[PDB]
């Protein structure tokens, strides 16, 4: 079984350049066509570029001449070099394993294997780490508590609870852009009201774009 891991997505100035990597593990993808597919705002899929086993490449018109796909069979990897980036290039970029090059007329099984994606943000705005505030459980069954993760850029932020031990009842809301241009979100969890006195609740916030890792204790006030 092949697994694909993309990396290199980050915040970049308009007009700037960025190189994405896709590392395959498990088996060689050297004989496969490899594809880049992008997605804006968690909706829509756009095929962007592909490379064959022999290093032959293909591009959509919107990126031709600005994007270059390449590969390295010894590292079992594929690369996407982006230049003269525009806001229209912002999005999540997936690496996807295609059929064996040159064989699709005889053996085509669909696009079986996708990476998790890497996020590209084209903007002149600065990186900014979040502030994390408790949403304290009410003193007054089921109780809710959470963490407010405020004023950060770019996406994404991840939130876990109790270092991943607590997953039932967790809702981490989609980030919303404020008028300032900064994102904010909340993560909440519902827990037995009887556990509020005896159980510790810690929200683990990671904003990797700003190197921010914060643990916030959330307790009754």
């Amino acid at each position: 079984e092949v697994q694909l891991v993309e990396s290199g997505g980050k915040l970049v100035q308009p007009g700037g350049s960025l190189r994405l990597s896709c590392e395959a593990s498990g088996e060689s993808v050297g004989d496969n066509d490899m594809h880049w597919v992008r997605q804006v705002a968690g909706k829509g899929l756009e095929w962007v570029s592909s490379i064959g086993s022999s290093g032959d490449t293909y591009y959509i018109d919107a990126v031709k001449g600005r994007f270059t796909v390449s590969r390295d069979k010894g590292r079992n990897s594929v690369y996407l070099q982006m230049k003269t980036l525009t806001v229209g290039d912002t999005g999540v970029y997936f690496c996807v394993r295609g059929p064996e090059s040159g064989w699709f007329y005889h053996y085509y099984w669909g696009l079986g294997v996708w990476g998790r994606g890497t996020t590209v943000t084209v903007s002149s705005a600065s990186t900014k780490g979040p502030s994390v505030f408790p949403l304290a459980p009410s003193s007054k069954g089921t109780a809710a508590l959470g963490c407010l993760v405020k004023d950060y850029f770019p996406e994404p932020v991840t939130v876990s609870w109790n270092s991943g031990a607590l997953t039932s009842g967790v809702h981490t809301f989609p980030a919303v852009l404020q008028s300032s241009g900064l994102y904010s979100l909340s993560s909440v969890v519902t827990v037995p009201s009887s556990s509020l006195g005896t159980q510790t609740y810690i929200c683990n916030v990671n904003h990797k774009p700003s190197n921010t890792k914060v643990d916030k204790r959330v307790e009754p006030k």
Binding site: L45, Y58, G98, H106, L111, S131, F133, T142, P174
Partner: protein
């Protein structure tokens, strides 16, 4: 260029009932080997896309027999014979006739219909830590409700607020098909300290009347 058109853009289906989604290509996807180079993918909340159907009508490995694909040439249909809650997501067709060049359809959102569920409502005051920095965020949570439509009104000392709140809503849950929603009221520290009673009033079909949660600063 080859264009891929999906229909409908969205549909909502009761579990147990069928769903049908179509894809139309501007050019035939049938090649001389008798095969139609059209795939279907699903993208579930929080996940990467996954293959459902390849070459028009072939279920991919692991895909249950509720999913079927049909069609030929330029028109293709994905049918889910009996929809389940876990099917919620976006469905995409994709042409591979131009391999290694590919083209995705615009996607179809599948929503799940279920019985009315009233939200549980919670209000959170701003933390002492935030207030120092000159800002006050007040958060109202609506947990596990259906249908999606919900109205949240903020009142400060019984005065209706407008222009100073933002909402966020979760994607429909894959197990219970409900939504959760947050509404956040942002005030300056000075404005927050001018008033005493903070309230969020929630109107929803599952409530017997609007529910107000409140606190005194």
């Amino acid at each position: 260029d080859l264009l891929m058109t999906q229909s409908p853009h969205s549909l909502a289906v009761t579990p147990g009932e069928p769903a049908s989604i179509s894809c139309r290509s501007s050019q035939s996807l049938l090649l001389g080997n008798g095969r139609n180079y059209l795939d279907w993918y699903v993208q579930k909340p929080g996940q990467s896309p996954q293959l459902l159907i390849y070459l028009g009508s072939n279920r991919a490995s692991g895909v249950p027999d509720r999913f079927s694909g049909s069609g030929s040439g330029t028109y293709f249909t994905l049918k889910i014979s009996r929809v389940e809650a876990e099917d919620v997501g976006f469905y995409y067709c994709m042409e591979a006739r131009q391999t290694p060049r590919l083209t995705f359809g615009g996607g179809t959102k599948l929503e799940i219909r279920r019985t009315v569920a009233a939200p549980s409502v919670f209000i959170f005051p701003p933390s002492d830590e935030q207030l120092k920095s000159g800002t006050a965020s007040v958060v109202c949570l609506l947990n596990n409700f259906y249908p999606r439509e919900a109205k949240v009104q903020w009142k400060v000392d019984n005065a209706l607020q407008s222009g100073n709140s933002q909402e966020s809503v979760t994607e429909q849950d894959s197990k219970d098909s409900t939504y959760s929603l947050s509404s956040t009221l942002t005030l300056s520290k000075a404005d927050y300290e001018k008033h005493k009673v903070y309230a969020c009033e929630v109107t929803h079909q599952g409530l017997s009347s609007p529910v107000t949660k409140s606190f005194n600063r």
